[PDB]
Amino acid sequence: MLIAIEGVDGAGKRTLVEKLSGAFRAAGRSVATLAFPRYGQSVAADIAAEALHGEHGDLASSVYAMATLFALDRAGAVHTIQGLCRGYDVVILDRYVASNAAYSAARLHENAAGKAAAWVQRIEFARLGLPKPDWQVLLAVSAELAGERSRGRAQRDPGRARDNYERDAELQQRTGAVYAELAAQGWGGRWLVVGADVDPGRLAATLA
Amino acid sequence: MLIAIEGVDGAGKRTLVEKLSGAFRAAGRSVATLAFPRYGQSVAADIAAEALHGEHGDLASSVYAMATLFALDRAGAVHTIQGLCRGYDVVILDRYVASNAAYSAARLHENAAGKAAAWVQRIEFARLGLPKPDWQVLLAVSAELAGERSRGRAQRDPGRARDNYERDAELQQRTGAVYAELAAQGWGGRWLVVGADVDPGRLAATLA
Ligand SMILES: Cc1cn([C@H]2C[C@H](O)[C@@H](COP(=O)(O)O)O2)c(=O)[nH]c1=O
Numbered sequence A, B: 001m002l003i004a005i006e007g008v009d010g011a012g013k014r015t016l017v018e019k020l021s022g023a024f025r026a027a028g029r030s031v032a033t034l035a036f037p038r039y040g041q042s043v044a045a046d047i048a049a050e051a052l053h054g055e056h057g058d059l060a061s062s063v064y065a066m067a068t069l070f071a072l073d074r075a076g077a078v079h080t081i082q083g084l085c086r087g088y089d090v091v092i093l094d095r096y097v098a099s100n101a102a103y104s105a106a107r108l109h110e111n112a113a114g115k116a117a118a119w120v121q122r123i124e125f126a127r128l129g130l131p132k133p134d135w136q137v138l139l140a141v142s143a144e145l146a147g148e149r150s151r152g153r154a155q156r157d158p159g160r161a162r163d164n165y166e167r168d169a170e171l172q173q174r175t176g177a178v179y180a181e182l183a184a185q186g187w188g189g190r191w192l193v194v195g196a197d198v199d200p201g202r203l204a205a206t207l208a
C-alpha cells in the first residue's frame, strides 16, 4: 500500500508520518517511509531547495522550472518506490506528486481544475510513470497556524531558515485551498482530509 | 582523450564530428561519439527541448532553469562518459559544458568572465563532477551564415523546426562572441578555434 501525506508548510506532516508509522507497526505491518524533496539524495532536489533560499539566479521565479525539478527528483526515486512497495506492507510518503499540483496552481493563482495540476498529472503519473498513491491524506490546518510553526522552526534552528514559499503567506493560503479542491476531486486517487487532532490508531485503521 | 565540439546553432558541428571521427579512425584510433542534449535518453533533455518549442509554461523564460536541465542531462551521462573514455581511444562530444556557459551568458548579456559562466563551472565541473575536456574545438562561423543553415534545415525537415534560441538572431550573435572569449581564456581546458574550411586530417593530428 502506498500512502502520501500532503498539506502546507508547517502543517505537522513529518510528525503525522512518525505517528502513523508507529500505529501501523503496532498493528504488525512493516512500514517504510520516504520524504520529498529528497534533500541530499538528488541534485534536482538540492538545487530546488537552494533556489528557494535565493540561489541559482532566476530559477525560482519560474513556476514550471521549480515543478520540473521536484518531478525530476521523484523520477530518480521510481525504482526505489517500486522496491519499497514490494518489500514492505505500507509505504508512507512525506509529500508526493500532489504537492507539485497544489503549489504550482497556487503560485499561478489557478485552481485544482486548472492547467498546472493537469500538467503535473501528465508529466509525473503518465510520462514519468510514478505510481498513483492508494491514499493521499490531507492534513488540513489553518494557514495562520502553519505559518507560525514554520516561523518557530526557523527561530530555534539555524539550519531551518524559511524558504521563499514559506515566507509567502498568501501563497500558503492559496495552496491550502487548492489542496482542499484536489481532495474533493479525488485527484490522483482517493483522499482523506484530517485535522491536527486526528487519531493515529484510527487513521491507520482507515488506511490499512 | 575527451574532445568537445562547440559553436552556435547551424555552425556545422555534427558534420565536423562525423569528419573528425572518420579522420581518427583512418589513423587507427577507436572513436566513440555522444551528443548533448541527449534527446530521447533523458527526461531533462526532452523537457528542455520541448520548452524551447513553446511547451511547459514559463520554464524557458528562466535562463538558470534551462541551464540546470542541460546540466542534469549531462549529470545522467557521467558514468557513460567515464566508461567511453576507458574503452575508446578518442571520445568526441557534439556540445558539452561550454555550450551552457556560452548560451547562458549570452541570454543574460554577460561576457565569458561573468556570473553565468562561473556558475556553470561551479555546478557542472566541481559539483556534478563532469570531466573537463582535453580539447574544446570552437567551430567559428558568421552568425548570419549559421542562421541561414538553421532556417534551411527547418524548411526541408518538418521534425527540425527552429526552437526559441535558433529564432533569436541577436542571441546567436552574442553566443558566438562569448564562445570566442571562452576560447581565448581557455575556459574548462585548452581550445582550438577552427573555421568551416578546417581540414579534418590536420585537425585530428592536432588533437591526437
Ligand atoms: C515535494 C514538493 C515540494 N514543493 C514545495 C513545498 C515546500 O514549500 C517546498 C519544499 O518542500 P518541504 O516543505 O517538504 O520540505 O517545495 C513543491 O512545490 N512541489 C513538490 O513536489
Ligand SMILES: Cc1cn([C@H]2C[C@H](O)[C@@H](COP(=O)(O)O)O2)c(=O)[nH]c1=O
Residues within 6 Å of the ligand: B009, B036, B037, B067, B070, B071, B095, B096, B097, B099, B100, B101, B103, B104, B165, B166
Ligand atoms: C547542450 C546545451 C545546449 N544549449 C542550447 C544550444 C541550442 O540552442 C539548444 C539545443 O541544443 P542543440 O542545438 O544541440 O541541438 O540548447 C544550452 O543552452 N546549453 C547546453 O548545455
Ligand SMILES: [Mg+2]
Residues within 6 Å of the ligand: A009, A010, A166
Ligand atoms: Mg517547507
Ligand SMILES: [Mg+2]
Residues within 6 Å of the ligand: B009, B010, B166
Ligand atoms: Mg539547435
